């Protein structure tokens with residue numbers, strides 16, 4: 001182009017809104033219809049909503065029936081307009097029912113069925129005057145036809161009615177008199193030859209493969225220290241906001257754990273539809289995040305805010321609503337920030353560059369509840385804290401006996417584990433933490449450990465196992481852990497099992513001592 005002017009194409013955003021509206025409708029018809037109206041994709045009149053449902057493009061027909069059956073004044077009007085879009089003139093009652101029953105699936109509730117079939121019968125009689133002496137006659141015969149369809153075509157009904165049985169069953173239905181024999185015979189024969197074809201409701205799959213996502217879409221984002229704008233594909237899921245360079249990427253460019261953040265609308269002189277992620281309680285403090293460098297190594301973010309531009313005000317509103325709903329809120333996060341800041345030493349920079357001290361990159365992994373975060377902050381803050389499950393990661397640098405340990409504590413919940421591999425690059429020591437009282441999950445821990453250490457990026461890492469929770473009754477001892485984690489086989493790697501109690505601190509310094517002694 002020569003000018004990198006950021007322009008998105010209307011086709012992208014409009015098709016996305018169309019797809020969004022349909023998705024919403026299929027979950028909740030009232031909410032989908034409201035979304036489409038707000039997004040100027042549907043007009044608000046009963047007639048306009050009726051045309052939308054009648055076309056029913058990509059709409060669940062059971063959901064259409066649910067909505068049309070409702071007692072609401074608006075819904076009643078939609079229903080009448082819906083039946084008016086059906087042309088029943090010059091069709092017999094079976095043929096008219098075939099048509100109508102293609103357009104929606106009958107709801108289960110008797111009062112809803114009645115409203116819809118009354119509306120149908122009224123429409124049929126207006127289209128075909130003189131055929132039936134009343135709407136009631138038409139309505140009742142419609143159900144005689146439906147019952148016939150069941151009797152003839154459902155194998156659970158043993159005795160199949162003949163034409164003559166169907167004719168005589170309907171004696172007197174025409175306001176006391178009989179309908180024409182040949183009319184009833186024609187209806188019978190039509191149903192006998194072809195059952196009602198019913199649109200059975202389907203299910204569709206998802207486009208991408210990542211974690212089940214709350215929202216995804218393209219946004220422009222401003223850099224941290226270097227204030228440059230980049231187009232990124234964002235995925236919001238499981239209390240984390242991820243971003244990628246391309247939809248085809250299979251690893252994130254950035255990860256933002258949504259811990260005690262807030263959202264504000266901002267005005268920007270050059271980009272439209274902007275909002276910011278920020279921490280209201282710690283103004284000016286760096287937001288926890290990580291991003292990938294050219295060589296694949298994950299590093300900490302430098303943002304005090306995340307300014308983001310959406311391609312439309314509608315998508316801005318969607319993203320703000322979604323992100324707000326996905327924020328993990330908890331005093332724990334404020335507790336960590338406050339305690340860290342108190343013992344924050346500015347001098348550490350001027351001393352770290354002077355001692356020019358080398359250090360050690362650590363990846364700390366293990367099943368959820370193993371004790372990882374407790375260990376991290378026991379080391380970082382010199383105290384045992386009451387933790388909550390980690391949705392993304394925690395990262396802290398700890399100085400211990402002349403070595404600076406950069407420790408990445410990654411969440412161990414099921415859903416997060418496929419992401420562990422992301423953090424491998426650059427790892428010099430693995431800390432694998434195990435709950436020694438959890439015999440139900442020790443084999444699972446073994447499986448995870450070996451997947452990690454067999455990875456091409458983890459071949460050189462020394463391995464420290466924290467055999468944690470030694471304070472608990474009947475907790476597995478280090479020798480049992482050695483066996484149960486299958487470490488005895490592995491004779492070509494440098495590993496050690498350190499007994500620990502993270503809550504008292506027992507064994508933690510001993511583990512860090514081992515790391516320093518064995519790192520080459």
Ligand SMILES: Nc1nc2c(ncn2[C@@H]2O[C@H](COP(=O)(O)OP(=O)(O)OP(=O)(O)O)[C@@H](O)[C@H]2O)c(=O)[nH]1
Pocket residue numbers: 366367368369370371372373374375385386387388389390391410411412413433468469470471472500501502503504
């Ligand atoms: N009895 C006992 N409990 C511990 C010990 N260490 C940690 N815990 C407790 O175990 C629970 C989980 O500990 P966490 O540090 O949050 O575990 P985690 O590995 O970070 O879990 P994720 O964040 O899901 O990955 C918490 O209630 C801790 O207080 C220990 O040595 N003994």
Ligand SMILES: O=P(O)(O)O[C@H]1[C@H](O)[C@@H](OP(=O)(O)O)[C@H](OP(=O)(O)O)[C@@H](OP(=O)(O)O)[C@H]1O
Pocket residue numbers: 222223224225226227228229230232253254291292301302303
């Ligand atoms: O691409 P250039 O112009 O060099 O600038 C980069 C990008 O804006 C990065 O965004 P992305 O990671 O999406 O590529 C950003 O990382 P963030 O992802 O943390 O915003 C960097 O922030 P700093 O490293 O803070 O300067 C910034 O230096």
Ligand SMILES: [Mg+2]
Pocket residue numbers: 372373374387388389390411412
């Ligand atoms: Mg944790």
